[PDB]
């Protein structure tokens, strides 16, 4: 998953959810120099049971759980889902990251 920023309180082990239900966990976060600009790259280890359920056009949001808690990766079904299902070779992007308290 590629995003502009990873988001604070997002560390390895953060839950990855589809429709709000956990389907996996975050494995790692790295900084990638894309077009001379640092961006956050997240590696998600997800159980392949739910891959058949997630469309390719799923929206990725690095939302926050509570005011005190940590953040999680959320996948949502779009208005016009694609018949193709995502896999390890499908690049995906995050629509937005919730604003920090700072």
């Amino acid at each position: 998953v590629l995003s502009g920023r990873a988001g604070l309180s997002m560390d390895p082990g953060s839950k990855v959810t589809f429709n709000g239900v956990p389907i996996g966990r975050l494995a790692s976060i790295d900084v990638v120099e894309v077009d001379d600009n640092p961006e956050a790259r997240l590696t998600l280890d997800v159980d392949p049971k739910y891959l058949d359920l997630i469309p390719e056009n799923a929206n990725v949001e690095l939302r926050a759980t509570t005011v005190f808690g940590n953040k999680y990766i959320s996948f949502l079904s779009p208005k016009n889902p694609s018949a193709e299902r995502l896999s390890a070779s499908t690049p995906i992007r995050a629509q937005g990251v919730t604003t920090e308290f700072n």
Binding site: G20, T65, T66, G69, Y72
Partner: protein, 263 residues
């Protein structure tokens, strides 16, 4: 030396395990006598309740410690209604199995080591071998069967008394409401954790009984050597119990912590 010592204890544990069916089919009365002895103690410790009373007291102390420290710290922070749930996750996971194991080790394991050392010194092992009777099958396998039969009621009583002590300390001494404590406890406690803890305790008790019977069966040096046997057996039992609980908890909750509060 070291390899030979490991081979000796390996041979002893194999010989004790393989003779369990023979003891079950031929030594039922001896098993019942050992079950009664372990459940009701022996010697001067059998007048105060035996192993049951010692287990009860130590578990009550551990639960009281958990409730006291937890309520104090959470009241100092402010979020003190969680104590109930916290108490549960302190008892099942790390405190009650280990403490029940150490108390069981002390009482039953030291009693078995003393009995077997006394028989070895009094030449009753030789008396058994003279009558053409499997000494290890008659003593160690019967002890193992009695311990496996007796561990489940003992650990059930230990869990019950630890829960009761934590609840009473929190909701009477600190005057917290019983409703909030019961709600958080019964909401954040998983019976799966209790069942896996029971399995951990059964495995730990079998290992402890094996170790203590090994130290008591090969005693030497007269009546003086029995005490050193008891001391070494107790040290080994401590180490084995702690290692067993650590490995079991690492395996069970390594990936899925089996606990959810937030979204």
């Amino acid at each position: 030396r070291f390899l030979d010592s490991m081979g000796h204890v390996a041979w002893f544990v194999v010989q004790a395990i393989v003779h369990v069916p023979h003891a079950f089919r031929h030594y039922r009365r001896e098993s019942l006598r050992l079950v009664a002895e372990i459940g009701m103690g022996t010697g001067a410790m059998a007048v105060i309740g035996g192993t049951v009373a010692i287990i009860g007291f130590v578990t009550l102390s551990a639960g009281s410690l958990i409730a006291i420290q937890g309520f104090a710290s959470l009241g100092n922070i402010g979020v003190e209604a969680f104590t109930g749930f916290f108490a549960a996750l302190a008892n099942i996971r790390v405190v009650a199995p280990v403490v029940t194991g150490q108390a069981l080790a002390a009482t039953v394991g030291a009693g078995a080591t003393a009995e077997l050392g006394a028989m070895r010194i009094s030449e009753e092992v030789d008396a058994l071998e003279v009558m053409g009777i499997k000494s290890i099958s008659y003593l160690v396998s019967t002890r193992i069967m009695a311990g496996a039969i007796v561990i489940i009621p003992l650990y059930a009583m230990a869990i019950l008394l630890s829960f009761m002590s934590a609840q009473l300390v929190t909701t009477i001494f600190y005057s917290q409401s019983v409703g909030t404590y019961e709600h958080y406890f019964h909401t954040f406690l998983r019976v799966d954790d209790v069942m896996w803890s029971f399995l951990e305790v059964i495995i730990m008790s079998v290992i402890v009984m094996l170790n203590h019977c090994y130290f008591g069966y090969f005693a030497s040096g007269g009546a003086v050597g029995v005490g050193e046997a008891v001391g070494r057996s107790m040290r080994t039992s401590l180490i084995a119990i702690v290692l067993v609980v650590l490995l079991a908890s690492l395996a069970l909750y390594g990936t899925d912590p089996n606990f959810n509060l937030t979204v």
